[PDB]
Amino acid sequence: KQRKDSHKEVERRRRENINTAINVLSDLLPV
């Protein structure tokens, strides 16, 4: 019936994945 997806949406998801990976890496840092 309807399609709910886009090339714009998936790239945002990948960017958020990279950002949260950076965040979890920085969590272990002392400073």
Partner 1 sequence: MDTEALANYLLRQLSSSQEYNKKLLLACGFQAILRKILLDARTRATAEGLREVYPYHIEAATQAFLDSQ
Partner 2 sequence: PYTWKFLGISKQLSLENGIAKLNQLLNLEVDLDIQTIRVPSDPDGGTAADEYIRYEMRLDISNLDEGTYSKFIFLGNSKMEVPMFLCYCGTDNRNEVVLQWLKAEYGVIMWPIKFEQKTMIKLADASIVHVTKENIEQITWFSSKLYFEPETQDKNLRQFSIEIPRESCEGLALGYGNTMHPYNDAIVPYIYNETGMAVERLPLTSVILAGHTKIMRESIVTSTRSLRNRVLAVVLQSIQF
Select the binding partner of residue 7 from partner 2, partner 1, none (C-beta < 5 to 8 A, by kind). Answer: partner 1
CB-CB neighbours of 25 under 10 Å? 9
Q: Is 23 in the site for partner 2 (CB under 8 A)?
A: yes
- Quote the tokens at residue 15: 């960017």
Among 10, 17, 18, 20, binds partner 2 (CB under 8 A): 20
Measured from the CB atom, the residue of 6 and 26 that comes closer to partner 1 is: 6
E strand spans, the chain:
none
Q: CA-to-CA distance for 15 and 8, rounded, in angstroms?
A: 11
Question: Which positions lie near partner 2, rule CB under 8 A?
Answer: 5, 12, 16, 20, 23-24
